[PDB]
């Protein structure tokens, strides 16, 4: 997944994506993937947290309902 390389370095438009150098951290690697609903008795609705907004997890990873 995040190991994509050379797609965007060869053609500005096209299905292929990726730069010249492989870097999962720069290609949407989950890093610490936490559910927004972690630490909650109920699951959050889809789109509750807008991307780019300051979010504080309600609990650690693994406490998702």
């Amino acid at each position: 997944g995040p190991f994509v390389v050379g797609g965007e370095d060869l053609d500005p438009f096209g299905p292929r994506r990726g730069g010249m150098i492989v870097d999962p951290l720069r290609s949407g690697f989950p890093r610490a993937l936490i559910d927004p609903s972690s630490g909650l008795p109920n699951r959050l609705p889809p789109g509750a947290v807008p991307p780019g907004a300051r979010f504080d997890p309600f609990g650690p990873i693994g406490t998702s309902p």
């Binding site: 190991f3 390389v5 492989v22 999962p24 690697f29 610490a32 936490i34």
Partner: protein, 213 residues
């Protein structure tokens, strides 16, 4: 499903001098929002002149370091001599590309001395694309530390500044300061800084504490 990868943090920095090479890393191993351990250095001594730093998926780092050790022993047996820093870099590039379709999630920086005695630094992408550099930061705080090394070591975006050759003491101070800043701003960097200094007199290790929060 099943994910064969995980991000365990860790920043690796290397600076090549005129007669020295420095490889530095933090000693914090993590996963998600937790800390696995506070003493897990990312620097490994390969030969008397070469030190490698590996960050990323920790299982891949362990396997890759063990494979590199085995290959160095094989080379010493087959050729009756130890590998050079450039030979190690080329071999590591081949090893990383051998897993092109299931890559090692490792950020590799090789720091040491070349055949002329000058400091050599090699930076690797996970599939083996590498080049020789004078300084390089890799890992979770690479984007934080690289511009500062460009400004301070490369004297970039500066005018009326003499390009004085980098000395060992100044490089050590700079490495300590940049890792202090990284520990300030990066959540994966902290709990210690381990510095390996590669000179013609051997390899010297040093430890500097960082903040634990």
């Amino acid at each position: 499903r099943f994910s064969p990868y995980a991000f365990n943090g860790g920043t690796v920095l290397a600076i090549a001098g005129e007669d020295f090479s420095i490889v530095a890393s933090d000693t914090r191993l993590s996963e998600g929002f937790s800390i696995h351990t506070r003493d897990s250095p990312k620097c490994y001594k390969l030969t008397d002149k070469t030190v490698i730093g590996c960050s990323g998926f920790h299982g891949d780092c362990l396997t890759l370091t063990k494979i590199i050790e085995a290959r160095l022993k094989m080379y010493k047996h087959s050729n009756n001599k130890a590998m050079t820093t450039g030979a190690i870099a080329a071999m590591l590039s081949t090893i990383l590309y051998s897993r092109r379709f299931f890559p090692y999630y490792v950020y590799n920086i090789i720091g040491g001395l070349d055949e002329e005695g000058k400091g050599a630094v090699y930076s690797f992408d996970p599939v083996g694309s590498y080049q020789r550099d004078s300084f390089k930061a890799g890992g979770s705080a690479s984007a934080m530390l690289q511009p500062l090394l460009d400004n301070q070591v490369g004297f970039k975006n500066m005018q009326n500044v003499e390009h004085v050759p980098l000395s060992l003491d100044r490089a050590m101070r700079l490495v300590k300061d940049v890792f202090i800043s990284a520990a300030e701003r990066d959540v994966y960097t902290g709990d210690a800084l381990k510095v390996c200094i590669v000179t013609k007199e051997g390899i010297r290790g040093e430890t500097v504490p960082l903040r634990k929060d």
